[PDB]
Tab-separated table of N, CA and C in Angstrom:
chain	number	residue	atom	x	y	z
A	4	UNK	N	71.711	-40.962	7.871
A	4	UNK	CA	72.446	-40.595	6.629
A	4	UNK	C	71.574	-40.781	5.390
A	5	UNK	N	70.830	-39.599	5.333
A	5	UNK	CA	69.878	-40.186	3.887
A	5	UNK	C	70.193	-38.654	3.184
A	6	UNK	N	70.262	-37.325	3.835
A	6	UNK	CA	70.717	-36.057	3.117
A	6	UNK	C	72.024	-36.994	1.913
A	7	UNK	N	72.274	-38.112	2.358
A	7	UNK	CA	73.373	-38.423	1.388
A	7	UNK	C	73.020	-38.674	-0.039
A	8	UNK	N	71.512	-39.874	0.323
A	8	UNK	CA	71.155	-39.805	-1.517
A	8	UNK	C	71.097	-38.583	-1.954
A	9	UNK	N	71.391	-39.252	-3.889
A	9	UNK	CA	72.032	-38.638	-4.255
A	9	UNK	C	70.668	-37.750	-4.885
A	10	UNK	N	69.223	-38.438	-4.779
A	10	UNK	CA	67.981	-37.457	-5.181
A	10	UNK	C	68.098	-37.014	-3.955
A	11	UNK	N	68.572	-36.173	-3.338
A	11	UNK	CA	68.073	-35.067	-2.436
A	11	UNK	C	69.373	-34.541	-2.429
A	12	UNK	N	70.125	-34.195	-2.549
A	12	UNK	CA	71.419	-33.541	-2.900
A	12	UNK	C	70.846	-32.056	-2.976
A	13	UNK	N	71.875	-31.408	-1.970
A	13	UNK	CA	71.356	-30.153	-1.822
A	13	UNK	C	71.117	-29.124	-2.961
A	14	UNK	N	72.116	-29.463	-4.147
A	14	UNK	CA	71.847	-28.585	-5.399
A	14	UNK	C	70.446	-28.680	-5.721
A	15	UNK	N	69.490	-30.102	-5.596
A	15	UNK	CA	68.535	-30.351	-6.049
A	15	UNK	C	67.047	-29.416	-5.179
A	16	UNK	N	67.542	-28.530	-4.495
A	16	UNK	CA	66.399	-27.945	-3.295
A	16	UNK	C	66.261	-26.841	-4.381
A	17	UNK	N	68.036	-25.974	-4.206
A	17	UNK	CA	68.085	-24.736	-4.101
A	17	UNK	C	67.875	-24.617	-6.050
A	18	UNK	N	68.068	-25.436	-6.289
A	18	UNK	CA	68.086	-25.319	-7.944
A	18	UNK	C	66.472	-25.048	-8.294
A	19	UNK	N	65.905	-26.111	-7.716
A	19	UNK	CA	64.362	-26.142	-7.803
A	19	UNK	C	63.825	-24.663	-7.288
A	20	UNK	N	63.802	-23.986	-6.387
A	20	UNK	CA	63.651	-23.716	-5.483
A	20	UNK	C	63.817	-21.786	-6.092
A	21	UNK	N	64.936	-22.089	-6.352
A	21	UNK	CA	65.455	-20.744	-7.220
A	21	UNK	C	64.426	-20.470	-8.602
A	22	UNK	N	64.280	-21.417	-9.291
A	22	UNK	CA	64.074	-21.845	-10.372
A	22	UNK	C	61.949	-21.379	-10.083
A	23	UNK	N	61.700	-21.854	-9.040
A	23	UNK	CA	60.266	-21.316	-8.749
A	23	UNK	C	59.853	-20.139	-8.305
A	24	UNK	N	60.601	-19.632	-7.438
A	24	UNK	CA	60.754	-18.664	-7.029
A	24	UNK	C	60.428	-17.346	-8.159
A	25	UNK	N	61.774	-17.655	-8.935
A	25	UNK	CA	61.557	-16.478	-9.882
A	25	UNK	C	60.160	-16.799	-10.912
A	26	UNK	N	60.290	-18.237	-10.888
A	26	UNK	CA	58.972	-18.128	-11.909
A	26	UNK	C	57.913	-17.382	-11.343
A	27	UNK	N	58.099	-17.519	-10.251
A	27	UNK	CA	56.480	-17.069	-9.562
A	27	UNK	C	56.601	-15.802	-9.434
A	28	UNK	N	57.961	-15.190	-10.117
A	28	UNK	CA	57.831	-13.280	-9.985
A	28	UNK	C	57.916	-13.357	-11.152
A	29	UNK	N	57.480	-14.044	-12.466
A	29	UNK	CA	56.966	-13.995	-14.107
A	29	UNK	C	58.030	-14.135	-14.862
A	30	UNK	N	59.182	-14.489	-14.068
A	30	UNK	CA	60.253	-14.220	-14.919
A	30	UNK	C	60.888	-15.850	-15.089
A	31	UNK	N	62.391	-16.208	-15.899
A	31	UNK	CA	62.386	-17.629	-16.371
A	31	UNK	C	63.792	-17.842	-16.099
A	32	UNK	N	64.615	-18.451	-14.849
A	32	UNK	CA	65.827	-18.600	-14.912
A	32	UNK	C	66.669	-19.326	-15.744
A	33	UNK	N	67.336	-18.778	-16.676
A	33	UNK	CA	67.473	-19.671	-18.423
A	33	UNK	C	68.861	-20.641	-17.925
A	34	UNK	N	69.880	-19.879	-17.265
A	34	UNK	CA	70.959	-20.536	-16.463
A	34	UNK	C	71.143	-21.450	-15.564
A	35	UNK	N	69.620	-21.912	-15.395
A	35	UNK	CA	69.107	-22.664	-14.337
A	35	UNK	C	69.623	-24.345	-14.672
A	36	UNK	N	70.808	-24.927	-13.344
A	36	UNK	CA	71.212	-25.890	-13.717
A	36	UNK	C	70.268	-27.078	-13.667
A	37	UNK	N	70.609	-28.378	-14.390
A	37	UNK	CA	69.658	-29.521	-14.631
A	37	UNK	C	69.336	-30.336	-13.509
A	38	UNK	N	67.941	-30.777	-13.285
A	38	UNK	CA	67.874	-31.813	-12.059
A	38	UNK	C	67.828	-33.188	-12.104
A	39	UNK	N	69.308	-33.541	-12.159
A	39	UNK	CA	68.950	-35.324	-12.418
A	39	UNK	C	67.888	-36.098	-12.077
A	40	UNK	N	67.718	-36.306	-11.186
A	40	UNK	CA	66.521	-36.828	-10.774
A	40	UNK	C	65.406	-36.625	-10.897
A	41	UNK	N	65.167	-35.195	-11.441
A	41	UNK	CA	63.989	-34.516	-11.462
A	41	UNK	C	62.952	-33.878	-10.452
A	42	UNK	N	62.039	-33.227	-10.635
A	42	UNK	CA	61.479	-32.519	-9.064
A	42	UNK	C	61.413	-33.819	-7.911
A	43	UNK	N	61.462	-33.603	-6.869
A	43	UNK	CA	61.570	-34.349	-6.203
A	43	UNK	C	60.395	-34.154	-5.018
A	44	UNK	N	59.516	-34.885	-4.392
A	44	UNK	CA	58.672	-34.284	-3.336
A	44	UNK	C	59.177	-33.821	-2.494
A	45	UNK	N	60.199	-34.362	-1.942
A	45	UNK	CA	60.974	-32.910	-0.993
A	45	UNK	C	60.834	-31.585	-1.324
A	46	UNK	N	61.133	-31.193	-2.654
A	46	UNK	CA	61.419	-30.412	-3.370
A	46	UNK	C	59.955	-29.667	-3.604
A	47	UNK	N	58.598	-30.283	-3.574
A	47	UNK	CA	57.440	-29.537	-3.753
A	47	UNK	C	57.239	-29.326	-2.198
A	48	UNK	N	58.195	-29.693	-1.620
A	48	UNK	CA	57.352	-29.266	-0.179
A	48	UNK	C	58.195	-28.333	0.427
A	49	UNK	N	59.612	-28.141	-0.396
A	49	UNK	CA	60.186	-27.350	-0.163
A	49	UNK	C	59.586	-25.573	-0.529
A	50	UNK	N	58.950	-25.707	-1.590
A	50	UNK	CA	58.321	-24.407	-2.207
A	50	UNK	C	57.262	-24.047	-1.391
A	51	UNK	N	56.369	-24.489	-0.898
A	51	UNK	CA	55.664	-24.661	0.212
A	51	UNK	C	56.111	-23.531	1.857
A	52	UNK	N	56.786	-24.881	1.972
A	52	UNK	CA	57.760	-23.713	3.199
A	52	UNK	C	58.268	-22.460	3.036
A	53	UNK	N	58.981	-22.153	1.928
A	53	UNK	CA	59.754	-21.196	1.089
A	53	UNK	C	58.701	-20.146	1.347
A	54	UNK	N	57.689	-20.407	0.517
A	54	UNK	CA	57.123	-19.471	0.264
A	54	UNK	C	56.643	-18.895	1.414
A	55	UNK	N	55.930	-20.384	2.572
A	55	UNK	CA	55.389	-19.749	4.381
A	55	UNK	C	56.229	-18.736	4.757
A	56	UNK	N	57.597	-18.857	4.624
A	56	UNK	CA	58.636	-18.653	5.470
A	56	UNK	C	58.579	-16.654	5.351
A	57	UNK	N	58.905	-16.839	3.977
A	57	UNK	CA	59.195	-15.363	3.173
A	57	UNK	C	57.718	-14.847	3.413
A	58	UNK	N	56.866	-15.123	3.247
A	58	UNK	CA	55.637	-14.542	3.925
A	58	UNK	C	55.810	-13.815	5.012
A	59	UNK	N	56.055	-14.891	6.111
A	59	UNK	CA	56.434	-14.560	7.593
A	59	UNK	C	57.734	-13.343	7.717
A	60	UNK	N	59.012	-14.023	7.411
A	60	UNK	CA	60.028	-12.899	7.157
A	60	UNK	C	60.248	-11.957	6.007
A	61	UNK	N	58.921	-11.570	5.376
A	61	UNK	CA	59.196	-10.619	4.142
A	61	UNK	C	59.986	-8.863	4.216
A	62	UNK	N	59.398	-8.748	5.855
A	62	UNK	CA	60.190	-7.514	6.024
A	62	UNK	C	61.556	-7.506	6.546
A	63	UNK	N	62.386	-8.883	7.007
A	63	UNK	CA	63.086	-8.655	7.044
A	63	UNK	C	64.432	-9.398	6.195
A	64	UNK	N	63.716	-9.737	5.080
A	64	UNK	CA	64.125	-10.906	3.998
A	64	UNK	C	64.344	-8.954	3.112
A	65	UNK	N	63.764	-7.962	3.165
A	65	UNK	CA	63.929	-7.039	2.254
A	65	UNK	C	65.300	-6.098	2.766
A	66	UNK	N	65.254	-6.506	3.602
A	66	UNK	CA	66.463	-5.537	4.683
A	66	UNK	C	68.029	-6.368	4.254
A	67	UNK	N	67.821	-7.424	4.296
A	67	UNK	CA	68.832	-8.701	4.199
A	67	UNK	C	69.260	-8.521	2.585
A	68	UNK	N	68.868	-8.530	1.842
A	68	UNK	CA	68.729	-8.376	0.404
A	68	UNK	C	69.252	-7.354	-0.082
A	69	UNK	N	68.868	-6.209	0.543
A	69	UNK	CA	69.117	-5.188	0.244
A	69	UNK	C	70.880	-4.980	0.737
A	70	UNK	N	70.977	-5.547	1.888
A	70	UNK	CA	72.312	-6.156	2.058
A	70	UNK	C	73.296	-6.680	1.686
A	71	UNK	N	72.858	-7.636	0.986
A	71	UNK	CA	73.563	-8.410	0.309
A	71	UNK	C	74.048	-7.925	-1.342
A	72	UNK	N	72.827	-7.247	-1.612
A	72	UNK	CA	72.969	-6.614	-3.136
A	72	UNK	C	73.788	-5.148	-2.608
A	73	UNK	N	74.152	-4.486	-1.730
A	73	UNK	CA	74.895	-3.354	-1.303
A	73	UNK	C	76.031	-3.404	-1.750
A	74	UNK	N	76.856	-4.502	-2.305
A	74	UNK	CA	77.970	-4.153	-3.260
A	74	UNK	C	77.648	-5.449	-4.187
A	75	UNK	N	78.180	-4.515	-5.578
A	75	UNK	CA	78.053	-5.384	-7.142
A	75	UNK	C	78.272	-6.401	-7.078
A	76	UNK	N	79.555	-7.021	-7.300
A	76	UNK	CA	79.900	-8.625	-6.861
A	76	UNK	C	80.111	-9.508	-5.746
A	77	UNK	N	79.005	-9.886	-5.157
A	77	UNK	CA	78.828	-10.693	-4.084
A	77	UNK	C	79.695	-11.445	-3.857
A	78	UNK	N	80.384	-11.654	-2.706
A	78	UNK	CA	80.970	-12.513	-2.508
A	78	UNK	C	80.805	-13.674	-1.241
A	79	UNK	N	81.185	-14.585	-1.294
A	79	UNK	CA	80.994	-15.423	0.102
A	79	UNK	C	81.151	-15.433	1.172
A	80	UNK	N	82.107	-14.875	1.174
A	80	UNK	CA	82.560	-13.793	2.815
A	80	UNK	C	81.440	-12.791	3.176
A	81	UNK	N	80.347	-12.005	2.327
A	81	UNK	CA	79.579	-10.840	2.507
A	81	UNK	C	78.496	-11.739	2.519
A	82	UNK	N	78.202	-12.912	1.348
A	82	UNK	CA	77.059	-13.689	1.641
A	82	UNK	C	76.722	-14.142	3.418
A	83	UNK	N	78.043	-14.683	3.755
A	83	UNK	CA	78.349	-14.940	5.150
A	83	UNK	C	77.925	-14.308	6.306
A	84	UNK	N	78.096	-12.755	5.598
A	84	UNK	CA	77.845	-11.893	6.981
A	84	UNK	C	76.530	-11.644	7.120
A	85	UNK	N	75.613	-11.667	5.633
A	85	UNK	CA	74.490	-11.412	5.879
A	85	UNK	C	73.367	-12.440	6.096
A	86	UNK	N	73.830	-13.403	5.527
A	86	UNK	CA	72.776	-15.142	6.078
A	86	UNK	C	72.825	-15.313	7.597
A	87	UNK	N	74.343	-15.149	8.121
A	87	UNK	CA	74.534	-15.453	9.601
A	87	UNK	C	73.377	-15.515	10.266
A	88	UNK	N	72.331	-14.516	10.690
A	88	UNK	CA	70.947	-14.590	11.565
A	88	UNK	C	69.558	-15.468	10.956
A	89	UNK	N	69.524	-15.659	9.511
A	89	UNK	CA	68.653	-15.798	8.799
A	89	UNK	C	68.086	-17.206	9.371
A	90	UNK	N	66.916	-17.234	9.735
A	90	UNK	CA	65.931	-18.250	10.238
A	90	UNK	C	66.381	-18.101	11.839
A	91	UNK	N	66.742	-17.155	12.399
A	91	UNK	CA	66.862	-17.022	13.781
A	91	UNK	C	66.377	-18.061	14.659
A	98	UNK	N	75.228	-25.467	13.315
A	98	UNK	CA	73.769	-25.078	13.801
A	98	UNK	C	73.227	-25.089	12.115
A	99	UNK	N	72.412	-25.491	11.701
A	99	UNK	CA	71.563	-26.027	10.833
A	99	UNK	C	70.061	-27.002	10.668
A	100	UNK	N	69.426	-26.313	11.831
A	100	UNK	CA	68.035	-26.788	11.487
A	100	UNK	C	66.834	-26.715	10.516
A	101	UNK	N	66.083	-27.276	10.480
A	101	UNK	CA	64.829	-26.742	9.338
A	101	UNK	C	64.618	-25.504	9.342
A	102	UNK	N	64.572	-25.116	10.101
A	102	UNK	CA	64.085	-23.441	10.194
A	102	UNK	C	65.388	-22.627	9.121
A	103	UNK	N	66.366	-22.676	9.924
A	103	UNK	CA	67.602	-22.265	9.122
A	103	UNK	C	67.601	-22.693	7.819
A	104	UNK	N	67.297	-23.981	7.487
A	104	UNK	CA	67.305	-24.337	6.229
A	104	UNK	C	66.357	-23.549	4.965
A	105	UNK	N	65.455	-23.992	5.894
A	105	UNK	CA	64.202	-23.343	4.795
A	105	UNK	C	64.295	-21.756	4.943
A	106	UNK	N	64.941	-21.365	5.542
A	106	UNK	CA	65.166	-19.515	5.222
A	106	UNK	C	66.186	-19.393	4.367
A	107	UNK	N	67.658	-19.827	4.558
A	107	UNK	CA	68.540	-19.843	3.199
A	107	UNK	C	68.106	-20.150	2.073
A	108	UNK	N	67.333	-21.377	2.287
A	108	UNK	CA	66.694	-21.374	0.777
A	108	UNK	C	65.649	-20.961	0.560
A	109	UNK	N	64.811	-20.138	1.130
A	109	UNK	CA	63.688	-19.256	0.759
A	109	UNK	C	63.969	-18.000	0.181
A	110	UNK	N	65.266	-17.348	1.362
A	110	UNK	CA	65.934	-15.916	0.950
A	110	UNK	C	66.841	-16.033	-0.409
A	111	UNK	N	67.310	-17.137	-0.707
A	111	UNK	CA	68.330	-17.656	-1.928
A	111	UNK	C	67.484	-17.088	-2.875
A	112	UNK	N	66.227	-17.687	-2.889
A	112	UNK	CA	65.058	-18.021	-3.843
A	112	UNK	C	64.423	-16.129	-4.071
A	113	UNK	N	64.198	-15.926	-2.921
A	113	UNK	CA	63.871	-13.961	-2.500
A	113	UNK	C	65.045	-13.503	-3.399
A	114	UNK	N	66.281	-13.327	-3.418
A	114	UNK	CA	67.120	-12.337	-3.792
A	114	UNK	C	67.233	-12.631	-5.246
A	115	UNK	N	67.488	-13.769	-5.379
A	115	UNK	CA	67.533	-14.444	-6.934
A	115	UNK	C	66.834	-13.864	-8.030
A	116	UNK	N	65.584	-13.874	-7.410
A	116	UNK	CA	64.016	-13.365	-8.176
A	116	UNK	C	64.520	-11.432	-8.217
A	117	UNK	N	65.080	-10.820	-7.493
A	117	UNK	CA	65.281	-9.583	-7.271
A	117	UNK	C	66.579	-8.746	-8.172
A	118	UNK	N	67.421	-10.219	-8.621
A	118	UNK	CA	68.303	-10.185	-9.388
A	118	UNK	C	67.922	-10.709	-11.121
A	119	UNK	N	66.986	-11.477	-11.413
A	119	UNK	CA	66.720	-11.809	-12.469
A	119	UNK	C	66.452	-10.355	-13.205
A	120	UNK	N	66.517	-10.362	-14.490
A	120	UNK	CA	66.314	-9.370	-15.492
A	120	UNK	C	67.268	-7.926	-15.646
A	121	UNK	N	68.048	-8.229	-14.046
A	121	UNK	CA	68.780	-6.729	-13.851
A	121	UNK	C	70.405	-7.385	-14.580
A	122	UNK	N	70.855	-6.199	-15.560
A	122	UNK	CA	71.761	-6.198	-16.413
A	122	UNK	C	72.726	-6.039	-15.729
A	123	UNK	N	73.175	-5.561	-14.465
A	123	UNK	CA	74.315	-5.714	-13.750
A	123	UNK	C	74.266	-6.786	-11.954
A	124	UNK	N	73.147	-7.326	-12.418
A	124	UNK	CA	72.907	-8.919	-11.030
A	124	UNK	C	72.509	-9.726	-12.132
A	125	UNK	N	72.064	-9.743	-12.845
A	125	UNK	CA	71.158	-11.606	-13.435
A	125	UNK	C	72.637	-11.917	-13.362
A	126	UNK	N	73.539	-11.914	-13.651
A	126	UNK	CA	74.701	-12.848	-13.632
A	126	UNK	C	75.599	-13.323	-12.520
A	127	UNK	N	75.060	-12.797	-11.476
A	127	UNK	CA	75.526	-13.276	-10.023
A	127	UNK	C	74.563	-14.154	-9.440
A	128	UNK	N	73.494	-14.787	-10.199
A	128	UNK	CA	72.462	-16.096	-9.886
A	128	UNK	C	73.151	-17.191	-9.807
A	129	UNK	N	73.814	-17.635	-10.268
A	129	UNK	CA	74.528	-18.963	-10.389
A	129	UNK	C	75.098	-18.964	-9.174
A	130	UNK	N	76.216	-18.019	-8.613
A	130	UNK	CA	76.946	-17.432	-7.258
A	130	UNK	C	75.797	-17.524	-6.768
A	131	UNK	N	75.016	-17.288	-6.488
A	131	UNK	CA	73.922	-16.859	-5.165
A	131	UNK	C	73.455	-18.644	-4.869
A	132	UNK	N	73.325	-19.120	-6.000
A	132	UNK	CA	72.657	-20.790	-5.950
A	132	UNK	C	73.863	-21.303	-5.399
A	133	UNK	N	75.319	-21.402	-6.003
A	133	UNK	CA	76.386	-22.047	-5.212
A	133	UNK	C	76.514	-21.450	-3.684
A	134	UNK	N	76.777	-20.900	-3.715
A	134	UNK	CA	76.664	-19.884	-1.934
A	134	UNK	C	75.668	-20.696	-1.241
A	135	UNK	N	74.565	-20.734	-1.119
A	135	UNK	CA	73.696	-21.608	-0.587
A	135	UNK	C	73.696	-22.774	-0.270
A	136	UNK	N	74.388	-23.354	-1.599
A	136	UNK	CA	73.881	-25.240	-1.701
A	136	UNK	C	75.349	-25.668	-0.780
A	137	UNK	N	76.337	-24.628	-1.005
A	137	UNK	CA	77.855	-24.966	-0.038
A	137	UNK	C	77.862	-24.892	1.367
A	138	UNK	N	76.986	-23.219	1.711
A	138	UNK	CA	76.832	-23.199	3.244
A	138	UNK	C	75.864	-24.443	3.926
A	139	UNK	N	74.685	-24.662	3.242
A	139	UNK	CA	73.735	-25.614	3.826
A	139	UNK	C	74.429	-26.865	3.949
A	140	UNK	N	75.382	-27.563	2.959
A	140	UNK	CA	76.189	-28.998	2.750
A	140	UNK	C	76.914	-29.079	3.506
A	141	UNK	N	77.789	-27.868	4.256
A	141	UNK	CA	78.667	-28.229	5.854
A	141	UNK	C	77.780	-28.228	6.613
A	142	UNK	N	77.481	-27.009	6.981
A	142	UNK	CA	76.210	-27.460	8.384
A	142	UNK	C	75.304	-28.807	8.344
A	143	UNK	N	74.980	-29.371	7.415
A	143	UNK	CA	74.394	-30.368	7.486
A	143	UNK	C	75.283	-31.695	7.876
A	144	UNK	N	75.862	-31.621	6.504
A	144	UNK	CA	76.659	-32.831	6.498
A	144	UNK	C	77.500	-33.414	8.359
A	145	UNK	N	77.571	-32.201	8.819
A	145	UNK	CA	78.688	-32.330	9.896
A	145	UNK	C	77.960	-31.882	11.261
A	146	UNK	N	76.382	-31.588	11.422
A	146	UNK	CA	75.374	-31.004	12.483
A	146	UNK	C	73.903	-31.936	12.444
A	147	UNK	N	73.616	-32.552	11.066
A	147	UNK	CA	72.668	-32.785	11.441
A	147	UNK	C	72.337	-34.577	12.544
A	148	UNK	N	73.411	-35.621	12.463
A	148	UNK	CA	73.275	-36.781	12.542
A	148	UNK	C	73.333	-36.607	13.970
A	149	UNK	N	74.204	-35.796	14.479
A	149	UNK	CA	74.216	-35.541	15.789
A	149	UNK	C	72.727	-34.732	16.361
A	150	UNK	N	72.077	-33.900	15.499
A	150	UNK	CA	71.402	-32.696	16.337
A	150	UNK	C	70.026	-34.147	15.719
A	151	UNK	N	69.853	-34.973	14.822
A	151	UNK	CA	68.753	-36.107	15.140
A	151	UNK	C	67.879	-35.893	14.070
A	152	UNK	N	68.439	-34.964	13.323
A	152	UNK	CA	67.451	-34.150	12.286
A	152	UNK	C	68.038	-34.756	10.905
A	153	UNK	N	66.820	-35.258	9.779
A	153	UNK	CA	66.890	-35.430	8.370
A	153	UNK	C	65.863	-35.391	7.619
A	154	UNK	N	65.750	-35.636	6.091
A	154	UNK	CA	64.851	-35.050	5.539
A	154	UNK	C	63.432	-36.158	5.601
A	155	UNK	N	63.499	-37.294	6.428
A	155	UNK	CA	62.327	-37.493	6.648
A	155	UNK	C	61.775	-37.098	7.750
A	156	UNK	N	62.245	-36.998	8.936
A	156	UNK	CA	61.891	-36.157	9.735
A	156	UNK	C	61.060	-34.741	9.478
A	157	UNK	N	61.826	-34.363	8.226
A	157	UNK	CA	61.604	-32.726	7.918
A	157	UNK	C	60.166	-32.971	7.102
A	158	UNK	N	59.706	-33.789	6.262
A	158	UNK	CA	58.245	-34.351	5.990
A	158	UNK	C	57.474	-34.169	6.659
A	159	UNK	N	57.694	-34.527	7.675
A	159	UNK	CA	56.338	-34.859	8.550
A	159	UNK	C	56.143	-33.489	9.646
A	160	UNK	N	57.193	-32.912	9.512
A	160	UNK	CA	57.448	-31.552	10.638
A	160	UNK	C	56.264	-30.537	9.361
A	161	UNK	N	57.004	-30.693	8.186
A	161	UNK	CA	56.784	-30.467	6.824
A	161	UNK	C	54.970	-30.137	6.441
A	162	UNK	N	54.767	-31.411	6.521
A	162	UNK	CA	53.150	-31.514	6.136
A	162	UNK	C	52.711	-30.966	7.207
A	163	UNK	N	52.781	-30.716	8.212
A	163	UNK	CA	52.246	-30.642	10.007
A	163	UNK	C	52.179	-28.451	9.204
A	164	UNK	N	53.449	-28.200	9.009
A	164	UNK	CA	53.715	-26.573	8.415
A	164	UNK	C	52.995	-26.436	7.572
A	165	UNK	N	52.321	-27.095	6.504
A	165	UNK	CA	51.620	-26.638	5.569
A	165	UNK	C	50.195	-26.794	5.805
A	166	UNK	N	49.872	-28.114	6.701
A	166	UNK	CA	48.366	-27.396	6.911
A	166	UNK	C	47.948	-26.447	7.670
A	167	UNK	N	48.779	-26.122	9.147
A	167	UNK	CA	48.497	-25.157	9.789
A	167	UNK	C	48.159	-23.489	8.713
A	168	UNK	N	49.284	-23.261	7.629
A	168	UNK	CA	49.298	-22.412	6.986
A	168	UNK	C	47.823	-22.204	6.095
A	169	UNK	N	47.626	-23.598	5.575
A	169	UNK	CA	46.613	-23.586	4.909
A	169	UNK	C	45.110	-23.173	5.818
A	170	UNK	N	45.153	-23.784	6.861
A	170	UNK	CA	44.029	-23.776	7.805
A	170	UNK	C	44.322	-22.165	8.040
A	171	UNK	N	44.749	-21.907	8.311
A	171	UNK	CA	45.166	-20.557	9.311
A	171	UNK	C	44.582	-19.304	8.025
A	172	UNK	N	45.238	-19.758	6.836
A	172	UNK	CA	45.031	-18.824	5.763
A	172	UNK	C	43.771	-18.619	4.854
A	173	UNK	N	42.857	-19.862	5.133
A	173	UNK	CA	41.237	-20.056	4.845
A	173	UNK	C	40.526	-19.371	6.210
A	174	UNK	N	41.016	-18.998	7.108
A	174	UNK	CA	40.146	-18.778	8.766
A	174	UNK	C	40.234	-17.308	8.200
């Protein structure tokens, strides 16, 4: 039980997370809620993965998206239908694709005059689906966020090594 502190609180991934994402497509999420605690190293290693991940699933992170943005006001029921496969029950893998693709669509919605205002929805949608599956899958399935560190650092050098070769 450590997903419980209150610095790792799932708002604190997807907030961050969202919040980089778009920066890193030039743009500045102004609606972007506050992080008590402040970045958190989870949270830099979360961008990390994010970014591996969407690398890896970029073609089908564009298919999904495109999905999800297929009608104007998103809703949670449609969010639902289209996360369902995403990171092909709540493990790291799963994790770090909701919040990679959160972070993907977000960035795809910033600046557009009929989506920038369904960002906030897209960040709640996320931080709600990930907080049941966790809260109620992970103590049993053996999995938490220190565990996810060390799985964590193990993912980022391979990437790094792999991506200098």
């Amino acid at each position: 039980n450590d997903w419980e502190e209150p610095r790792l609180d799932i708002e604190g991934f997807v907030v961050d997370y969202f919040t980089h994402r778009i920066r890193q497509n030039g743009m500045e999420w102004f609606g972007a809620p506050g992080l008590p605690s402040g970045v958190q190293p989870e949270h830099e290693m979360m961008r990390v993965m994010g970014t591996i991940f969407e690398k890896k699933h970029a073609e089908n992170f564009e298919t999904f998206s495109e999905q999800l943005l297929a009608v104007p006001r998103i809703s949670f029921s449609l969010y639902q239908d289209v996360v369902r496969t995403v990171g092909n029950p709540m493990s790291y893998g799963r994790l770090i694709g909701l919040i990679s693709f959160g972070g993907f669509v977000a960035a795809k919605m910033m600046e557009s005059v009929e989506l920038q205002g369904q960002v906030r929805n897209l960040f709640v949608y996320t931080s709600l689906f990930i907080k049941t599956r966790i809260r109620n899958n992970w103590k049993e399935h053996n999995r938490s966020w220190d565990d996810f560190m060390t799985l964590g650092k193990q993912m980022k050098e391979d990437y790094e090594r792999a991506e200098a070769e």
